[PDB]
Amino acid sequence: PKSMQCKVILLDGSEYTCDVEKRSRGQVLFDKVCEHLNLLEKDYFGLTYRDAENQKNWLDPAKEIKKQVRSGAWHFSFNVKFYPPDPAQLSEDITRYYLCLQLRDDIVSGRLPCSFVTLALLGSYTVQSELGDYDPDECGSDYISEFRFAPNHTKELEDKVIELHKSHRGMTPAEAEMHFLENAKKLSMYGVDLHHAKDSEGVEIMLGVCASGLLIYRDRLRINRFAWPKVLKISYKRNNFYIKIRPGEFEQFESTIGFKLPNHRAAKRLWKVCVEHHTFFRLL
Protein backbone atom coordinates (compact mmCIF):
# COMPACT_ATOMS: atom_id res chain seq x y z
CA PRO A 1 0.00 0.00 0.00
CA LYS A 2 1.10 3.54 -0.91
CA SER A 3 0.47 6.22 1.77
CA MET A 4 0.23 10.01 1.11
CA GLN A 5 1.33 12.60 3.71
CA CYS A 6 -1.61 14.87 4.76
CA LYS A 7 -1.05 18.25 6.50
CA VAL A 8 -4.02 19.79 8.42
CA ILE A 9 -4.10 23.33 9.88
CA LEU A 10 -5.89 22.95 13.25
CA LEU A 11 -8.07 25.73 14.67
CA ASP A 12 -5.33 26.91 17.14
CA GLY A 13 -3.00 27.47 14.11
CA SER A 14 -0.96 24.29 14.80
CA GLU A 15 -0.26 21.70 12.02
CA TYR A 16 -1.25 17.97 12.28
CA THR A 17 0.55 15.51 9.91
CA CYS A 18 -0.68 11.94 9.24
CA ASP A 19 -0.63 9.49 6.29
CA VAL A 20 -3.55 7.81 4.44
CA GLU A 21 -3.59 5.22 1.61
CA LYS A 22 -3.44 7.25 -1.68
CA ARG A 23 -6.99 6.07 -2.71
CA SER A 24 -8.51 6.93 0.76
CA ARG A 25 -11.82 8.89 0.84
CA GLY A 26 -12.14 12.19 2.73
CA GLN A 27 -13.86 10.52 5.79
CA VAL A 28 -10.62 8.49 6.44
CA LEU A 29 -8.47 11.60 6.92
CA PHE A 30 -11.32 13.38 8.81
CA ASP A 31 -11.74 10.45 11.30
CA LYS A 32 -7.95 10.65 12.06
CA VAL A 33 -8.14 14.46 12.64
CA CYS A 34 -11.20 14.05 14.96
CA GLU A 35 -9.49 11.22 16.97
CA HIS A 36 -6.44 13.48 17.44
CA LEU A 37 -8.70 16.37 18.60
CA ASN A 38 -10.65 13.94 20.87
CA LEU A 39 -13.86 15.12 19.09
CA LEU A 40 -17.09 13.02 19.13
CA GLU A 41 -19.64 15.53 17.70
CA LYS A 42 -17.62 15.70 14.43
CA ASP A 43 -20.55 16.13 11.93
CA TYR A 44 -20.61 19.94 12.65
CA PHE A 45 -17.05 20.00 11.17
CA GLY A 46 -15.24 19.37 7.90
CA LEU A 47 -11.89 19.74 6.11
CA THR A 48 -11.28 22.47 3.52
CA TYR A 49 -8.60 22.60 0.80
CA ARG A 50 -7.64 25.24 -1.83
CA ASP A 51 -8.29 24.29 -5.49
CA ALA A 52 -6.11 25.46 -8.46
CA GLU A 53 -8.31 28.61 -8.79
CA ASN A 54 -7.18 29.00 -5.08
CA GLN A 55 -10.87 28.69 -3.95
CA LYS A 56 -11.78 27.13 -0.53
CA ASN A 57 -13.66 23.83 -1.11
CA TRP A 58 -15.14 21.34 1.37
CA LEU A 59 -13.38 17.96 1.15
CA ASP A 60 -16.26 15.56 0.37
CA PRO A 61 -15.96 12.68 2.87
CA ALA A 62 -17.65 10.21 0.41
CA LYS A 63 -15.09 10.83 -2.40
CA GLU A 64 -11.39 10.00 -2.93
CA ILE A 65 -9.08 12.70 -1.64
CA LYS A 66 -6.92 12.51 -4.84
CA LYS A 67 -9.95 13.14 -7.14
CA GLN A 68 -10.65 16.40 -5.18
CA VAL A 69 -7.15 17.86 -4.44
CA ARG A 70 -6.24 16.73 -8.04
CA SER A 71 -2.98 18.65 -8.90
CA GLY A 72 -2.77 20.49 -5.49
CA ALA A 73 -0.86 19.59 -2.30
CA TRP A 74 -2.49 17.34 0.36
CA HIS A 75 -2.88 20.41 2.64
CA PHE A 76 -6.15 20.95 4.54
CA SER A 77 -7.75 23.05 7.30
CA PHE A 78 -10.08 21.65 10.02
CA ASN A 79 -13.20 23.94 10.20
CA VAL A 80 -16.77 24.28 11.40
CA LYS A 81 -19.02 23.38 8.43
CA PHE A 82 -22.48 23.52 10.14
CA TYR A 83 -22.64 26.25 12.81
CA PRO A 84 -25.08 25.07 15.53
CA PRO A 85 -27.85 27.69 16.01
CA ASP A 86 -28.00 26.47 19.66
CA PRO A 87 -24.48 25.70 20.95
CA ALA A 88 -25.97 25.23 24.49
CA GLN A 89 -27.48 21.92 23.23
CA LEU A 90 -24.18 20.40 21.98
CA SER A 91 -23.61 17.39 24.21
CA GLU A 92 -19.87 18.15 24.85
CA ASP A 93 -17.66 21.02 26.14
CA ILE A 94 -14.85 20.04 23.70
CA THR A 95 -17.32 20.62 20.77
CA ARG A 96 -18.04 24.15 22.14
CA TYR A 97 -14.29 24.74 22.52
CA TYR A 98 -13.45 24.05 18.83
CA LEU A 99 -16.53 26.10 17.86
CA CYS A 100 -15.11 29.08 19.85
CA LEU A 101 -11.71 28.65 18.07
CA GLN A 102 -13.44 28.82 14.64
CA LEU A 103 -15.45 31.90 15.67
CA ARG A 104 -12.25 33.63 16.94
CA ASP A 105 -10.82 33.18 13.42
CA ASP A 106 -14.16 34.24 11.78
CA ILE A 107 -13.90 37.49 13.84
CA VAL A 108 -10.17 38.30 13.33
CA SER A 109 -10.49 37.55 9.54
CA GLY A 110 -13.48 39.96 9.32
CA ARG A 111 -15.92 37.27 8.03
CA LEU A 112 -18.02 37.83 11.23
CA PRO A 113 -18.51 41.62 11.65
CA CYS A 114 -18.79 42.67 15.31
CA SER A 115 -19.50 45.98 17.14
CA PHE A 116 -16.63 47.31 19.32
CA VAL A 117 -18.30 46.33 22.65
CA THR A 118 -19.06 42.76 21.35
CA LEU A 119 -15.40 42.39 20.13
CA ALA A 120 -14.38 43.48 23.70
CA LEU A 121 -16.91 41.14 25.40
CA LEU A 122 -15.99 38.04 23.30
CA GLY A 123 -12.30 38.91 23.83
CA SER A 124 -12.96 39.01 27.62
CA TYR A 125 -14.52 35.49 27.61
CA THR A 126 -11.58 34.19 25.47
CA VAL A 127 -8.99 35.61 27.99
CA GLN A 128 -11.00 34.15 30.98
CA SER A 129 -11.09 30.74 29.19
CA GLU A 130 -7.32 30.90 28.34
CA LEU A 131 -5.70 32.69 31.40
CA GLY A 132 -8.30 32.32 34.15
CA ASP A 133 -9.16 35.15 36.55
CA TYR A 134 -8.01 38.75 35.87
CA ASP A 135 -4.49 39.40 37.33
CA PRO A 136 -3.07 42.97 37.68
CA ASP A 137 0.56 41.62 38.00
CA GLU A 138 0.42 40.29 34.37
CA CYS A 139 -1.33 43.40 32.88
CA GLY A 140 -0.18 47.02 33.50
CA SER A 141 -1.79 50.21 32.02
CA ASP A 142 0.20 49.53 28.77
CA TYR A 143 -0.88 45.82 28.44
CA ILE A 144 -1.45 44.30 24.92
CA SER A 145 -2.72 40.64 24.91
CA GLU A 146 -1.07 38.08 22.59
CA PHE A 147 -4.73 37.17 21.72
CA ARG A 148 -6.13 38.47 18.41
CA PHE A 149 -9.62 39.85 19.10
CA ALA A 150 -10.41 41.75 15.90
CA PRO A 151 -9.46 42.56 12.30
CA ASN A 152 -7.85 45.79 13.64
CA HIS A 153 -6.57 46.30 17.22
CA THR A 154 -6.60 49.59 19.17
CA LYS A 155 -5.38 50.25 22.72
CA GLU A 156 -9.03 51.22 23.59
CA LEU A 157 -10.18 47.70 22.58
CA GLU A 158 -7.38 46.13 24.74
CA ASP A 159 -8.51 48.31 27.66
CA LYS A 160 -12.19 47.22 27.23
CA VAL A 161 -11.25 43.48 27.08
CA ILE A 162 -9.42 43.97 30.46
CA GLU A 163 -12.30 45.93 32.12
CA LEU A 164 -14.82 43.20 31.07
CA HIS A 165 -12.35 40.37 32.04
CA LYS A 166 -12.26 41.79 35.62
CA SER A 167 -16.00 40.96 35.96
CA HIS A 168 -15.59 37.22 34.99
CA ARG A 169 -13.70 36.31 38.28
CA GLY A 170 -14.28 32.58 39.11
CA MET A 171 -15.54 31.65 35.62
CA THR A 172 -14.27 28.26 34.40
CA PRO A 173 -13.15 27.73 30.76
CA ALA A 174 -16.32 25.80 29.81
CA GLU A 175 -18.48 28.59 31.31
CA ALA A 176 -16.51 31.41 29.54
CA GLU A 177 -16.82 29.38 26.23
CA MET A 178 -20.59 29.01 26.73
CA HIS A 179 -20.93 32.80 27.36
CA PHE A 180 -18.74 33.44 24.28
CA LEU A 181 -21.15 31.33 22.14
CA GLU A 182 -24.44 32.71 23.64
CA ASN A 183 -23.20 36.17 22.46
CA ALA A 184 -21.51 35.16 19.14
CA LYS A 185 -24.60 33.17 17.98
CA LYS A 186 -26.71 36.41 17.93
CA LEU A 187 -24.42 38.22 15.46
CA SER A 188 -26.13 38.86 12.07
CA MET A 189 -23.42 36.88 10.14
CA TYR A 190 -23.01 33.95 12.62
CA GLY A 191 -22.35 30.81 10.50
CA VAL A 192 -23.14 32.75 7.21
CA ASP A 193 -21.03 31.42 4.28
CA LEU A 194 -20.91 34.29 1.67
CA HIS A 195 -20.60 33.75 -2.12
CA HIS A 196 -20.07 36.56 -4.71
CA ALA A 197 -22.72 36.57 -7.44
CA LYS A 198 -24.67 38.93 -9.75
CA ASP A 199 -28.52 39.15 -9.91
CA SER A 200 -30.52 38.81 -13.20
CA GLU A 201 -29.90 42.60 -13.73
CA GLY A 202 -26.05 42.17 -13.56
CA VAL A 203 -25.82 43.93 -10.15
CA GLU A 204 -23.19 42.41 -7.77
CA ILE A 205 -24.68 40.75 -4.63
CA MET A 206 -23.49 38.36 -1.89
CA LEU A 207 -25.46 35.11 -1.44
CA GLY A 208 -25.30 33.94 2.22
CA VAL A 209 -25.94 30.27 3.17
CA CYS A 210 -26.67 29.38 6.80
CA ALA A 211 -28.72 27.20 9.22
CA SER A 212 -31.95 29.28 8.80
CA GLY A 213 -31.95 29.71 4.99
CA LEU A 214 -30.59 31.84 2.15
CA LEU A 215 -29.65 35.53 2.29
CA ILE A 216 -29.27 37.95 -0.70
CA TYR A 217 -27.14 41.04 0.24
CA ARG A 218 -27.95 43.60 -2.53
CA ASP A 219 -27.07 46.71 -0.41
CA ARG A 220 -27.78 47.98 3.17
CA LEU A 221 -31.42 48.61 2.03
CA ARG A 222 -34.00 45.77 1.55
CA ILE A 223 -32.06 42.51 2.35
CA ASN A 224 -33.96 39.45 0.94
CA ARG A 225 -33.95 36.24 3.10
CA PHE A 226 -35.60 32.83 2.43
CA ALA A 227 -36.05 30.46 5.42
CA TRP A 228 -35.31 26.86 4.29
CA PRO A 229 -39.07 25.93 4.39
CA LYS A 230 -39.71 28.57 1.61
CA VAL A 231 -37.03 26.95 -0.73
CA LEU A 232 -38.37 23.97 -2.75
CA LYS A 233 -35.55 23.40 -5.30
CA ILE A 234 -31.99 24.78 -5.75
CA SER A 235 -30.12 24.15 -9.06
CA TYR A 236 -27.09 25.08 -11.18
CA LYS A 237 -26.53 25.16 -14.95
CA ARG A 238 -23.26 26.51 -16.46
CA ASN A 239 -22.39 29.74 -14.48
CA ASN A 240 -25.96 30.07 -13.12
CA PHE A 241 -27.51 29.32 -9.72
CA TYR A 242 -31.36 29.20 -9.44
CA ILE A 243 -33.59 29.08 -6.32
CA LYS A 244 -37.25 27.86 -6.61
CA ILE A 245 -39.26 29.72 -3.85
CA ARG A 246 -42.35 27.62 -2.73
CA PRO A 247 -45.61 29.28 -3.91
CA GLY A 248 -47.13 31.56 -1.18
CA GLU A 249 -50.82 30.87 -0.26
CA PHE A 250 -53.35 31.08 -3.20
CA GLU A 251 -50.54 32.09 -5.66
CA GLN A 252 -50.69 29.60 -8.60
CA PHE A 253 -47.00 29.76 -9.64
CA GLU A 254 -43.68 29.70 -7.73
CA SER A 255 -41.04 32.39 -8.51
CA THR A 256 -37.52 31.38 -9.71
CA ILE A 257 -34.60 33.66 -8.71
CA GLY A 258 -31.39 33.27 -10.75
CA PHE A 259 -27.84 34.48 -10.08
CA LYS A 260 -24.67 34.67 -12.15
CA LEU A 261 -21.59 33.10 -10.49
CA PRO A 262 -17.99 33.81 -11.62
CA ASN A 263 -17.77 30.33 -13.23
CA HIS A 264 -19.35 26.88 -13.31
CA ARG A 265 -17.26 25.60 -10.31
CA ALA A 266 -18.39 28.62 -8.21
CA ALA A 267 -22.02 27.64 -9.16
CA LYS A 268 -21.54 23.89 -8.35
CA ARG A 269 -19.88 24.81 -4.99
CA LEU A 270 -22.73 27.18 -3.96
CA TRP A 271 -25.33 24.48 -4.92
CA LYS A 272 -23.52 21.83 -2.79
CA VAL A 273 -23.17 24.06 0.37
CA CYS A 274 -26.92 24.99 -0.11
CA VAL A 275 -28.05 21.32 -0.39
CA GLU A 276 -25.89 20.40 2.68
CA HIS A 277 -27.21 23.32 4.86
CA HIS A 278 -30.81 22.43 3.74
CA THR A 279 -30.23 18.80 4.93
CA PHE A 280 -28.73 20.22 8.21
CA PHE A 281 -31.86 22.45 8.81
CA ARG A 282 -34.00 19.28 8.21
CA LEU A 283 -31.92 17.49 11.00
CA LEU A 284 -32.87 20.29 13.52
Ligand X SMILES: Cc1csc(NC[C@H]2CCCO2)n1
- List binders of ligand X among 9-48 (CB under 6 A): 43
Phi and psi dihedrals of 163, rounded to 5? -55, -50
- 283 near ligand X, judged by CB under 6 A: yes
Stretch that binds ligand X, among 114-122, 138-146, 191-199, 276-284 (CB under 6 A): 276-284
3-17: buried (b, 16+ CB within 10 Å) or exposed (e) per residue?
ebebebbebeeeeee
Cβ neighbours for 159, distance < 8 A, ≥ 6 positions apart: none
Neighbours of 249 (CB within 10 A): 4
CA distances from 88 to 42, 92, 274 (A): 16, 9, 25
Cβ neighbours for 221, distance < 8 A, ≥ 6 positions apart: none
Nearer of residues 59 and 122 to ligand X, judged by Cβ:
59
- 83 near ligand X, judged by CB under 6 A: no
Stretch that binds ligand X, among 140-148, 157-165, 190-198, 274-282 (CB under 6 A): 274-282
Stretch that binds ligand X, among 22-30, 199-207, 263-271, 273-281 (CB under 6 A): 273-281
* DSSP letter string, 10-69: -TTS-EEEEEEETT-BHHHHHHHHHHHHT-S-GGGEEEEEE-TT--EEEPPTTSBSHHHH
Nearest position to ligand X, beta carbon: 43
- 279 near ligand X, judged by CB under 6 A: yes
**Shortest spacing between CB 43 and ligand X, in angstroms:** 4
- 280 near ligand X, judged by CB under 6 A: yes
- 276 near ligand X, judged by CB under 6 A: yes
**Shortest spacing between CB 277 and ligand X, in angstroms:** 8
Which of residues 30, 74, 76, 82 is near ligand X by CB under 6 A? Answer: 82
Please tell me the count of residues contacting ligand X according to CB under 6 A: 6
- The residues of the shown chain that bind ligand X, judged by CB under 6 A, are 43, 82, 276, 279-280, 283
